[PDB]
Amino acid sequence: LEEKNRMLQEDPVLFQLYKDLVVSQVISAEEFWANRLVGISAAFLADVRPQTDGCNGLRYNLTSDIIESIFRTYPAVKMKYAENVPHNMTEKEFWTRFFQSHYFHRDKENSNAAIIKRFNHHSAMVLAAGLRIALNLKKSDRYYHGPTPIQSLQYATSQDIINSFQSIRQEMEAYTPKLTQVLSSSAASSTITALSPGGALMQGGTQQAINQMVPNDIQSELKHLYVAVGELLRHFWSCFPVNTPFLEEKVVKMKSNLERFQVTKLCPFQEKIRRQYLSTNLVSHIEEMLQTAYNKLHTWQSRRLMKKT
Amino acid sequence: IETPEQAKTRERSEKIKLEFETYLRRAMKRFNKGVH
């Protein structure tokens, strides 16, 4: 309850989506939520210091991360905290004792032995806490003619082509450069006319500002409906390919949800266009996708029936 | 954790207060002995 509600508050669009899906009786909350569903270092004491501010300030800043690190590395601190805090002593009092205890300020053969033993024990605690095909092608010509289909490579006739090959071979054998014959004023005018704006080569031009034809609120609603449709169709195609009877029932439920979504949200949105008489066929894409899904499902039903005939 | 200079000043203050308290105790004991 509280856990699920907090997720909705994190994503208002999801809450809007959840409102459009479950509140509108389009889908159940059960089917809704069916779709929805640190290292340890040795410096945890050396780096951690009592923070002294500019003027007499002990900013201990007792974060859980350091406390958890100490408890994992030192179960003794955990045991003392459990057996004392907050009954025998308060948590801040325990931390002050730890700061002032000789176990923290370890700082003479006995002292050297104590330091060595403490270092060895610390290393042991850290280590313990760390625990918890040759290929050969056949048809190379497939690469020479890949995804390109068979072109219309029309071949010439009999050896007379050679005569034509001779003709150019004789036509350009005695060649003189020409300048006037290269272009003419009529040819230039025709080329400009082809290149003139709005001409045969200049296809199309400026288009209509569809951004102003679609209201921004309608834009946002279209985006939200697109998100909803995409989620529903992702659930629909996720079942595909169908290999078990459960997928058939899930797809039937998804189709029912899509139909209810179209009835509840799409049509008043459609009327919202029709009342505003928007000429943009924004809904046409959504209708095409929905009809494509319907056709795919019905075709698979036909195939399964034929398999059952 | 106090800075070492502040710790030394605190120790001096504690020592002076303890010495004055001992002096007051001595004066009180002398006064009580005299009264007795």
Swiss-Prot record, chain A:
Keywords: Acetylation, DNA damage, DNA repair, Host-virus interaction, Nucleus, Phosphoprotein, Repeat, Transcription, Transcription regulation, Ubl conjugation
GO cellular component, one term: nucleoplasm
Mod. after translation: (Microbial infection) Upon Rift valley fever virus infection, interacts with NSs leading to ubiquitination by the NSs-FBXO3 E3 ligase and proteasome-dependent degradation.
Location relative to the cell: Nucleus
Secretion signal, residue range per the UniProt entry: none
MF terms in GO: chromatin binding; nuclear thyroid hormone receptor binding
GO biological processes: DNA repair; hormone-mediated signaling pathway; nucleotide-excision repair; positive regulation of DNA-templated transcription; regulation of cyclin-dependent protein serine/threonine kinase activity; transcription by RNA polymerase I; transcription by RNA polymerase II; transcription initiation at RNA polymerase II promoter
Main location: nucleus
Domain BSD: 1-37, 54-106
Protein family per UniProt: Belongs to the TFB1 family.
Record note on quaternary structure: Component of the 7-subunit TFIIH core complex composed of XPB/ERCC3, XPD/ERCC2, GTF2H1, GTF2H2, GTF2H3, GTF2H4 and GTF2H5, which is active in NER. The core complex associates with the 3-subunit CDK-activating kinase (CAK) module composed of CCNH/cyclin H, CDK7 and MNAT1 to form the 10-subunit holoenzyme (holo-TFIIH) active in transcription. Interacts with PUF60.
Function: Component of the general transcription and DNA repair factor IIH (TFIIH) core complex, which is involved in general and transcription-coupled nucleotide excision repair (NER) of damaged DNA and, when complexed to CAK, in RNA transcription by RNA polymerase II. In NER, TFIIH acts by opening DNA around the lesion to allow the excision of the damaged oligonucleotide and its replacement by a new DNA fragment. In transcription, TFIIH has an essential role in transcription initiation.
Protein's UniProt name: General transcription factor IIH subunit 1
Native species: Homo sapiens (Human)
Gene coding for it: GTF2H1
